[PDB]
Design a protein around this ligand. Structure first.
Ligand SMILES: [Mg+2]
Ligand SMILES: [Mg+2]
Ligand SMILES: [Mg+2]
Ligand SMILES: [Mg+2]
Ligand SMILES: [Mg+2]
Ligand SMILES: [Mg+2]
Ligand SMILES: [Mg+2]
Ligand SMILES: [Mg+2]
Ligand SMILES: [Mg+2]
Length: 101
RNA sequence: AGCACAGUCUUAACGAUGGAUGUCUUGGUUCCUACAGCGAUGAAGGCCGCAGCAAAAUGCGAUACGCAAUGAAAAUUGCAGUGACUGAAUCAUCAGAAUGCUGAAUGUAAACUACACCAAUUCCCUGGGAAUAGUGGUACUCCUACAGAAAA
């Protein structure tokens, strides 16, 4: 195995990878997204292209205290991802929507 | 209220169409003078992004029409905003910090954001306390050391 006298390259700056901010941008408030809130218990978010399904689940949980059981994804033509997030039964989508806007 | 035949051709006066002429020039062209390469510490070129409202060109790189520092030094604007009674609003300089995916492109591939193996990795206080599937390495040829094994 390698036993260098010293590493070739050493970084010392703050991390450059995407964290929870920059991985979720903002909720989408179109007239199709407002309908999902009441009769489907679903919220819609716009996300960075490089996000996974698991990434979005974790980031939404850490940002808004949201428990979810299903995420669906689609890449749009403006360079963004759209996420349809089903909220678990204990959560009511209306109160979560009111808590943030 | 009345009087000129119509067409065709000629000449004056006033207009239409068109963009010559004259004047202008932050642009070309030639000559003279000085200096001179960049790259595995990742170049030239290509793609993708960045502004409160933002298409092109110009400028920048997840700190993204700009940060820090140094010299000047009150304004900058379409609206909204931001600034002193001078590290602040703006201009210049530019040495610190930062610098996406690629490309000789170098783990294996490529009208794929496809697939491997090895080491888990990165922070904060001063041995604790946290976070994260995230980070780095692995082409070919060659030189100097070294390591053991093999033949003789
Ligand atoms: Mg699909
Ligand atoms: Mg006649
Ligand atoms: Mg040379
Ligand atoms: Mg590029
Ligand atoms: Mg000072
Ligand atoms: Mg100053
Ligand atoms: Mg490769
Ligand atoms: Mg194929
Ligand atoms: Mg060869």
């Amino acid at each position: 195995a390698r036993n260098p006298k010293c590493p070739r390259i050493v970084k010392s700056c703050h991390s450059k990878t995407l964290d929870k901010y920059g991985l979720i941008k903002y909720p989408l408030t179109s007239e199709k997204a407002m309908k999902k809130i009441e009769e489907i218990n679903t919220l819609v978010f716009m996300c960075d292209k490089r996000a996974n399904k698991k990434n979005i689940k974790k980031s939404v949980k850490n940002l808004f205290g949201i428990e979810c059981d299903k995420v669906n994804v689609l890449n749009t033509l403006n360079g963004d991802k759209k996420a349809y997030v089903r909220l678990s039964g204990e959560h009511d989508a209306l109160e979560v929507a009111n808590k943030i806007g």
